[model samples]
Target chain A: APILLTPGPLTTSYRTRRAMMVDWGSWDSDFNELTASVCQRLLKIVGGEGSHTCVPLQGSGTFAVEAAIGTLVPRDGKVLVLINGAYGKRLAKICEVLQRPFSTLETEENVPTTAADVERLLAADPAISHVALIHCETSTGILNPLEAIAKVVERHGKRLIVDAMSSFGAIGIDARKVPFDALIAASGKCLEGVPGMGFVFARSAALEASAGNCHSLAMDLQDQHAYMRKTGQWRFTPPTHVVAALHEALSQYEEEGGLPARQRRYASNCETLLGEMARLGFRSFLPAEIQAPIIVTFHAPRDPRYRFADFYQRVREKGFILYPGKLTQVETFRVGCIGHVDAAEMRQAVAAIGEALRELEV
Target chain B: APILLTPGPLTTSYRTRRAMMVDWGSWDSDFNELTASVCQRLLKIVGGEGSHTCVPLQGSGTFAVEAAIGTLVPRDGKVLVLINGAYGKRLAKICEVLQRPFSTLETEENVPTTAADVERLLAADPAISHVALIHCETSTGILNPLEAIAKVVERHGKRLIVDAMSSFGAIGIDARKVPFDALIAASGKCLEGVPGMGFVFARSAALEASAGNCHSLAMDLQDQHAYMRKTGQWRFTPPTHVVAALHEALSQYEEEGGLPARQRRYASNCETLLGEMARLGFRSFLPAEIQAPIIVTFHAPRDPRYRFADFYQRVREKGFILYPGKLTQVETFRVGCIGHVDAAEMRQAVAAIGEALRELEV
Candidate 1:
């Protein structure tokens, strides 16, 4: 099997993948209990025991983020989206399609959105009822200041929704500390599970308050939450195998010491990759301060003969797959550190990259 | 492991489940090729080769249905929904939530939507540009007349969108015989794949004409199709394992002789289940003429001692799981015939139900 160094749908453990081997009854009590257990454990990850509810939606992470915005923001609601990367811009686009009014606090790809900027924006825009932030934007591997922004948004008495798609599992964000209205993530990210399902950690009060806000029935977070609460099953058909794999992944997550240990492993992977790649004469796209450990973006080779297609194909032939960059201002590529890969695999990947580089004479 | 007698997320073969073991590179050429092959195969299922494009969205059947409505229906579009059971009502509800204008031609739970009714509705209301019908409304296991409805809709120059959720694989609807704008189906259900993904077979011209009509970016079928056509990759993170399982399931489907063979097996399963259950004193809700072989809806026992909870628990204890009734006016339950299980398993399931009935003293 090819190893994915893309942000997600990346490498997963055999045990985690094997969990899908069993067929599940979607509407059965045992399956519902499994779902409840998953939701409970997810809430526990964020220290949201009494305050938040984990609602798993049946789609990719974008579906959860879109649902979060669609369900939480009222029809006349206005959201202030802090844009620094593709994912943040996606939030604004979700708002646009949902027909919810929205404004953006735009920042450079390398720049992180600060609480000061949010404070100024909130001060200027009285109509901004909610704020959305991307915890780790994989587009440029930039980790925005989520805690600080959450503090500022809370201080201003506005709801904060965090798109923690690539960071939720490996990066800790305690709801008790951050006070976010909703934090969205998916199965196939830092959790090291396969993709198919996305979930939200919604503050219970916030979720309940926005009952009839959603415009789409399938994506109505509150409705999904309520129905699950009542029936202990998804409002619609769930990705059973994906959820089962996630449950298995969560068990592995705990065995690996949960968030901190996973973060340490990914951080080590990132460090090793960066050091080894730098020795190969590749340059990092973002400085260390704002760069996320989830994925690292590298500026393309300065050689005119070096084409990304040839390099990518050659590297992939060496048993590793890399992601093309999502940046507009730079020609770059990205490698994720947040999967089943470790420091050793990261080193091997770097060595593969070195071989590819020499083979292509880049 | 328990057998899922529920409609979907049902029992799948170990081989199908094992397909999820490999971690796929979601953005890689190999996966894209796999996706392309899956699309090509799915299009072939409905005999929709020359005129149709198969668009796979990353969600459940409802998500695809919503995307189909959002993408195909214009802002001012009026839809004539044929409602008989829960699924049909859900379609109208989807329209209501999307803010699309729709009128329903309601039918009794036991009745099928006739072509004559559709013709009359279209004649009575010239504003109805599109007509939506459920091929098999699993709510009551009543298969709607898709070919007949399609003939009328086509004759009236109206587009038809089919929600073939539970009937797609096992029930054949040849695009050569039926002129439908779009027909939706999912990975699970009759294909014996695990749940997570849903797909649409849209007439290429119809799909191309409605480029910017979608209300949600994640569910923009047109955008998904356009992007896949340009670069054969899902616009968002796809359920890699689900797709892989689906590929495996499709292969098994073909090996088992495609729709006719699968349909024959399910029909046999349904026959055995119904025969055994009727002997045990349970009556099917729908008449034999209209009841779909996909699932059989049975009215609750006339005995006052018969509670679904007790019967279900006892049956579950005996190794088979069942579905609760989705109908409002009747107290009933459902048993599915469309999974990896065959006549033997169906007979075994009926035996379990017999034991449950005796154990419950009903």
Candidate 2:
């Protein structure tokens, strides 16, 4: 199997890929029930229990993010975006596209946004009714303190929107403790499913308040949630094979000890990558304290002998694929540690990266 | 191989299904080249040439429809929707969600929307800046006279949008001859490909003028087009396998004589189905002259011995599944004639349907 060290569409299990062979009927009750079940299980994992609902939309993680922002935040309302990486910048772009009023609080790429910054921004902008932040900025592998930020937003009576795309299932979001109005992620990321669809875990109170605000018909999360909840069927043709793969992936997730176990495994893999890459003369973009276990950015050597394309080609030749960094201001590349990856595979990937670096000798 | 008689996510060739088994990088230059090729080839099929550009979006056919309407139709602009079936109803709903000023003129399911009615509607409501209609509403297999509708819309100086989801490749749609502004279709359906993606063909003039109107970040047609044009890459991770399958399907289309050849195959299958099912006492809902070659709705038996679910289950157990009619006012089911299907498979499916009816004692 080829190793996918990219921030998802990361590596998924074989069974997840195999499940795509089935020809499923989107209107079939059995398939729709599977879609409903996936949503329910996601809500449970986020600790929403009975107080939140799940809505799945076709497309990648950003589709769900845009759907949440466009539908939940009204045209007249404004949101405060905490920008740290590409995902946050992407969300701000979404707000602009939807023509929703938005303001950004920029944080350094190497550091996560602090609670104090959010509090200060909220106090300064009374027009801001919603706040969005990325939990794990996959670009630099920095895990933001969502809990602390949530408290700050809540104190100012603002709704919290989280792009927990890379950290959702593997990390303990525990929405019951944090209670984000909306948390977006996709089927193919940490959940180890294929990429084709995304889901949003939304607090019930927030969802109810979002009734008449949706801007697009196909992506109206409120209608999608209501229809699935009432009929156990998708409002449209759900991607059946993707759902089946996710169903199987979630089962494997439980068997592997859920979030805590998965997180521990990923953390171990991250440590192994850091140790091996450090020896290979590569420096990480983020320091140890705030770094996430999902994906890490690496500063490429400044020597004239080094080039990302050549380096990527060399690593790919050794059966490992790497994700190019998304940092706007820096030259770096990223490698993910999430999905069904392991220590054994991580070690092999690290060995390959080392070999590639040596071959370039930069 | 099993033949799919239902509307899309229809049964594709073994090679097309096999394409899904591989892992594709969303950002790999090679993969990006594949996505670019898919869009380019699809534009060629739609008679795009130099007058149009292709934009592929994630999700089902409706996603593309909403993206086009929500982006192209300004808030103060009016879109006149010609409704004959479910898809038309959906177009109206999409416009409503975006808060575009719109009006509808509906015809019976068995009949196409007349150009005279459209012309009159535009005359009555000069505020109507755009008109949207379905070329072939697969719901009842009525092929609207797109030539006439386009002429009327053009004569009125109003933009025309066509939802050609089921008719794009398998049907003859020379965008060069029609005054249509945008034509939307999905990867599955008549392309002999699988589902999970949708593509649109936008007129070059309208596409250029309507920049920055997209509502969803992921579903933004203009941005997706711009990114592909700039980098020869997708704005986000695409349904790579689906795009690959469609690309393969296009090659097969050319090898097997393209649109004329595919349409002839579907037409011959429809003829065989009509001839055989008539012998088995199954009458069609639309008359022979009006129904398109794509799919047909058959009337349920008047006898009390019939149950659609039981009949469907038995037929499915025999390896043939049918689609229930979506018409709110009728009792019917539909069978499609697209994809890698022929008269022999149609005969086999007819045998299965006959057996199912016999089991129900019809």
RMSD of each: 1.4, 2.1
**Per-residue lDDT tens digits of candidate 2, residues A228-340?**
77867777656666788788888888888888888899899999889888987789988999888989899878888878889888888898889886766778988888777
Q: Could you tell me the TM-score of candidate 2? A: 0.95
lDDT (Cα, tens digit) per residue for candidate 2, span B58-90: 888889888788667766788999999998999
Q: What's the iRMSD of model 1?
A: 0.9
Instruction: Assign candidate 2 its CAPRI class.
Output: medium
C-alpha lDDT (0 to 100) for residue B307 of candidate 2: 80
Off by over 4 Å in 2: A124-126, B1-4, B124-126
Kindly report which residue stretches of model 1 are placed more than 4 angstroms away from their true locations once superposed. none
Worst 10 residues of 2 chain B by lDDT: B1-10
**TM-score of each model's B chain?**
0.98, 0.97
Candidate 2 residue B210 Cα shift, in angstroms, is 1.6
Write model 1 residue lDDT over A159-215, tens digit each, in one string. 899999999988879888898989999999998888989999888988998888887
